[PDB]
Curated annotation (Swiss-Prot), chain B:
Native organism: Severe acute respiratory syndrome coronavirus 2
Biological role: Subunit of the fusion protein that is processed upon entry into the host cell. Mediates fusion of the virion and cellular membranes by functioning as a class I viral fusion protein. Contains a viral fusion peptide that is unmasked after S2 cleavage. This cleavage can occur at the cell membrane by host TMPRSS2 or during endocytosis by host CSTL. In either case, this triggers an extensive and irreversible conformational change that leads to fusion of the viral envelope with the cellular cytoplasmic membrane, releasing viral genomic RNA into the host cell cytoplasm.
Protein name (Swiss-Prot/TrEMBL): Spike protein S2'
Residues of the full protein shown: 981 to 1029 of 1273
Mutagenesis or variant effect for residue 2 to A: In strain: Alpha/B.1.1.7
Domain of life of the source: Viruses
Length: 49, 49
């Protein structure tokens, strides 16, 4: 197992998926085409904001 | 590969890979039967001559 952790904007939460381009996955953090495993996304307006 | 997102595109091109493979399989099968009726006539010519 190989974990990850970061905090992004709520508009681009669907930008993370494999094969999607943009600016976050084009400059900061890309996922492979053959990505096995998955993400856990939840709102955190109470804590991080 | 340009418009479709990459994992879905792989689904839509499975039609074209097996669509042309069925076209070659059908074409080869007709030549296998058609070569049998020529060898039935090549052996008739080799018997007549």
């Amino acid at each position: 197992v190989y974990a990850d952790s970061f905090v992004i904007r709520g508009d681009e939460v669907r930008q993370i998926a494999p094969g999607q381009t943009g600016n976050i996955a084009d400059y900061n953090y890309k996922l492979p085409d053959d990505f096995t495993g998955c993400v856990i996304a939840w709102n955190s307006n109470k804590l991080d904001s | 590969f340009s418009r479709l997102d990459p994992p879905e595109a792989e689904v839509q091109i499975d039609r074209l890979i097996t669509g042309r493979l069925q076209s070659l399989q059908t074409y080869v099968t007709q030549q296998l039967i058609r070569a049998a009726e020529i060898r039935a006539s090549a052996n008739l010519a080799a018997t007549k001559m």
